[PDB]
Amino acid sequence: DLKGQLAKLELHLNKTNGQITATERTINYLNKLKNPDPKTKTQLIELTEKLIKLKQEFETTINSQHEIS
Amino acid sequence: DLKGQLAKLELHLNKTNGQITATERTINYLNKLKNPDPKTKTQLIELTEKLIKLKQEFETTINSQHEIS
Amino acid sequence: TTALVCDNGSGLVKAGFAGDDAPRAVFPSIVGRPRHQGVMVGMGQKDSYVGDEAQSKRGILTLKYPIEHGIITNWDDMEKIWHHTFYNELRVAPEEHPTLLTEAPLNPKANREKMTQIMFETFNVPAMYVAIQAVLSLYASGRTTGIVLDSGDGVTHNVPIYEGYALPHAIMRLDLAGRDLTDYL
Amino acid sequence: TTALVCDNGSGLVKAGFAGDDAPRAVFPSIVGRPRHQGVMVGMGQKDSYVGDEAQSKRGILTLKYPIEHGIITNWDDMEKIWHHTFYNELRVAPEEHPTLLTEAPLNPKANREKMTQIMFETFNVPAMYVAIQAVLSLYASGRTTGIVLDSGDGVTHNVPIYEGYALPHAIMRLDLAGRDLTDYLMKILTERGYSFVTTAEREIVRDIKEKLCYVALDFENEMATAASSSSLEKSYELPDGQVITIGNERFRCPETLFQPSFIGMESAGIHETTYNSIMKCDIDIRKDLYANNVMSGGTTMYPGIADRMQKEITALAPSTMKIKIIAPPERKYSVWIGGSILASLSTFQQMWITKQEYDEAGPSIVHRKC
Ligand SMILES: Nc1ncnc2c1ncn2[C@@H]1O[C@H](COP(=O)(O)OP(=O)(O)O)[C@@H](O)[C@H]1O
Ligand SMILES: Nc1ncnc2c1ncn2[C@@H]1O[C@H](COP(=O)(O)OP(=O)(O)O)[C@@H](O)[C@H]1O
Ligand SMILES: [Mg+2]
Ligand SMILES: [Mg+2]
């Protein structure tokens, strides 16, 4: 069981990292803008918050995986 | 009478083994296929069941032959 | 919902979902047809292999490329590729999600119309969009002012943009790409 | 119903039913005619004995072979053999069941047509099919990708297949087989004093070949060992209570397979033909054929043939490639074991050539699938 759950944790960590990369790319694109469309102004904040949430989730997952080890 | 019936049981066992060999060869050929024709899909199941039936018949025949012994 | 982002290329097909960092599936855009008789019974006959299995069994197939120099030459084989991508490879029904395609600049008009019709009448996607290959590079790069130099297989093109105002008279197109290099090799 | 699977060979006839593991009857394909007067009264006047009874009474008969090098030379004798197989040996009327026959590749067209006509007009089977000998071996082996090396009496042929797509340009055919080895055995046994001339004496030499022969891993070293010492000697007993003592000839008979220049021929040994067949295919499939070689036929039962074949191919072929010689036991019947399997398959039960089809289309029918 231990090995299977460790593998599942690894898969979840990989998925979280894959999400972080795309969100960081989108925020990197949106930052350069100078007079963004009103919708983009809200979308930038939404992505900024989602990045933080994903980073804490990644931290928690890695901590749990290390704890099992 | 005992000797004659024992000989008949031996003959029946020989015939059953001869059938098992051919059925196993056919199933061994059919397994390797990867996209079998629709007819072959059913024939494989039919042969798989016939093999089981023959093996149980062989077990029963050998048990009877031993019991006579 | 998630919107598929397929990139029908000239030498490879990359298909995936939005909000990812890499294509979900990537495979060559070739169609192989059998060449020899076929003597064994039961194998079940197949008219033409498509995608990666064709590359696996290249020994006894006549591989053909539906696309060349960006333009689409053979359509019945380009539709087979699209069907394989949507059902066998991605494993998602195309009706639910929209789709985004990419087409090189200065291509014939008819191509766009035919692609649209094949993507509406036959596959029945609820919405489709098509974009120029060079422009999409600048989102990935992260800037707005630049001169992209996209060089895929088949063709190579240059599209200069400044403050998000693409200059259309400066665009350049040329038919030197990987296929010619392979032939020269 | 059960469909007969006969395998008219060049040196033996094997006939049986489908869904079995061995031929129902197996007997030589010879026809013997009496040679002498006949003096006693009341004994049945037989024009010609056929099958095994002729082999039993070979003393006073002139045995003849209807088939040679795969091709059929004498047709009356072949029809007699077929009649004996169907009625006396199998003991089943041919009208009820279909039949499946086997013919070697690259044979003359006329053969097939004449076989069909003799199997329809005279015997009146309801359906007949004919198959290439090499292909049926792969059903028995159990694979789909390989290079069979069927080596019967009379001729030997190579047919490479990949994913069930037979390559027809790589097929190779060669006329070196057991009969030439028997003749060479007679010719070299002449040296020690033993002289075998008549046909029955040839039959005796064939038994000598079967029992006492083997293939040396290396030839020059084996010859040196046999000359220096006297350990490679065997004693055999004739029907006349006489003892032959064979020495080197134990491994000079089969050696002609790898060195066809012994008989005056010019072609290359069998390993070179196999290698050439492998290298006549495409580049991408050579590894798979290298991995899976197959042997069939009686002639490939010499003790030690597999090892020498593997060694020679490995020496000829590039390194980094793994070569295996799939050489299962009971290879003698391998070809026949294929046919029965091919008969059993449900799909194949649609591919026969019904009698009315031949009546309408004509003789060309059989060649459409050739
Ligand atoms: N690592 C590499 N080094 C050199 N050439 C490459 C490499 N990877 C791909 N190529 C060349 O690029 C071509 C594929 O281009 P691709 O990225 O598919 O462009 P497109 O998506 O427009 O088809 C191939 O034909 C190959 O010759
Ligand atoms: N055990 C054996 N060892 C060596 N040679 C054999 C053996 N059995 C058969 N042969 C040779 O093979 C020949 C028979 O081949 P056969 O299997 O009948 O081929 P086909 O089926 O094509 O006629 C015989 O003439 C004999 O010389
Ligand atoms: Mg590209
Ligand atoms: Mg044979």
From Swiss-Prot, chain C:
Chain positions with N6-methyllysine modification: 80
Residue ranges, annotated region (Interaction with alpha-actinin): 106-119
Changes after translation: Oxidation of Met-40 and Met-43 by MICALs (MICAL1, MICAL2 or MICAL3) to form methionine sulfoxide promotes actin filament depolymerization. MICAL1 and MICAL2 produce the (R)-S-oxide form. The (R)-S-oxide form is reverted by MSRB1 and MSRB2, which promotes actin repolymerization. Monomethylation at Lys-80 (K84me1) regulates actin-myosin interaction and actomyosin-dependent processes. Demethylation by ALKBH4 is required for maintaining actomyosin dynamics supporting normal cleavage furrow ingression during cytokinesis and cell migration.
Positions of post-translational N6-malonyllysine modification: 57
Location(s) in or outside the cell: Cytoplasm, Cytoskeleton
Domain of life: Eukaryota
Residues where Methionine (R)-sulfoxide is found: 40, 43
Sites bearing Tele-methylhistidine, chain numbering: 69
Note in the entry: In vertebrates 3 main groups of actin isoforms, alpha, beta and gamma have been identified. The alpha actins are found in muscle tissues and are a major constituent of the contractile apparatus. The beta and gamma actins coexist in most cell types as components of the cytoskeleton and as mediators of internal cell motility.
Quaternary state and interactors: Polymerization of globular actin (G-actin) leads to a structural filament (F-actin) in the form of a two-stranded helix. Each actin can bind to 4 others. Interacts with alpha-actinin. Identified in a complex composed of ACTA1, COBL, GSN AND TMSB4X. Interacts with TTID. Interacts (via its C-terminus) with USP25.
Similarity comment: Belongs to the actin family.
Free-text function comment from the UniProt entry: Actins are highly conserved proteins that are involved in various types of cell motility and are ubiquitously expressed in all eukaryotic cells.
Protein name: Actin, alpha skeletal muscle
Source taxonomy: Eukaryota, Metazoa, Chordata, Craniata, Vertebrata
Gene transcribed to yield this protein: ACTA1
Residues of the whole record sequence present: 7 to 191 of 377
From Swiss-Prot, chain D:
Role played: Actins are highly conserved proteins that are involved in various types of cell motility and are ubiquitously expressed in all eukaryotic cells.
The keyword Hydrolase is assigned to this record: yes
Keyword list, A-Z: Acetylation, ATP-binding, Cytoplasm, Cytoskeleton, Hydrolase, Methylation, Muscle protein, Nucleotide-binding, Oxidation
Catalytic activity: ATP + H2O = ADP + phosphate + H(+)
GO CC, any one term: actin filament
GO molecular function: ATP binding; hydrolase activity
Location of N6-malonyllysine modifications: 57
Other facts noted in the record for this chain: In vertebrates 3 main groups of actin isoforms, alpha, beta and gamma have been identified. The alpha actins are found in muscle tissues and are a major constituent of the contractile apparatus. The beta and gamma actins coexist in most cell types as components of the cytoskeleton and as mediators of internal cell motility.
Post-translational modification: Oxidation of Met-40 and Met-43 by MICALs (MICAL1, MICAL2 or MICAL3) to form methionine sulfoxide promotes actin filament depolymerization. MICAL1 and MICAL2 produce the (R)-S-oxide form. The (R)-S-oxide form is reverted by MSRB1 and MSRB2, which promotes actin repolymerization. Monomethylation at Lys-80 (K84me1) regulates actin-myosin interaction and actomyosin-dependent processes. Demethylation by ALKBH4 is required for maintaining actomyosin dynamics supporting normal cleavage furrow ingression during cytokinesis and cell migration.
Pfam families: Actin (PF00022)
Compartment list: Cytoplasm, Cytoskeleton
Family: Belongs to the actin family.
Entries under InterPro entries matching the protein: Actin (IPR004000), Actin/actin-like_CS (IPR020902), Actin_CS (IPR004001), ATPase_NBD (IPR043129)
Residues where Methionine (R)-sulfoxide is found: 40, 43
Keyword Nucleotidyltransferase included in the entry's annotation: no
Enzyme Commission number(s) from the entry: 3.6.4.-
GO BP: mesenchyme migration; positive regulation of gene expression; skeletal muscle fiber development; skeletal muscle thin filament assembly
Interaction with alpha-actinin, as annotated region: 106-119, 354-366
Disulfide pairings: none
Modified residues (N6-methyllysine): 80
Natural source organism: Bos taurus
In-chain residues carrying the UniProt-annotated modification Tele-methylhistidine: 69
The protein's name in its UniProt record: Actin, alpha skeletal muscle
Assembly description: Polymerization of globular actin (G-actin) leads to a structural filament (F-actin) in the form of a two-stranded helix. Each actin can bind to 4 others. Interacts with alpha-actinin. Identified in a complex composed of ACTA1, COBL, GSN AND TMSB4X. Interacts with TTID. Interacts (via its C-terminus) with USP25.
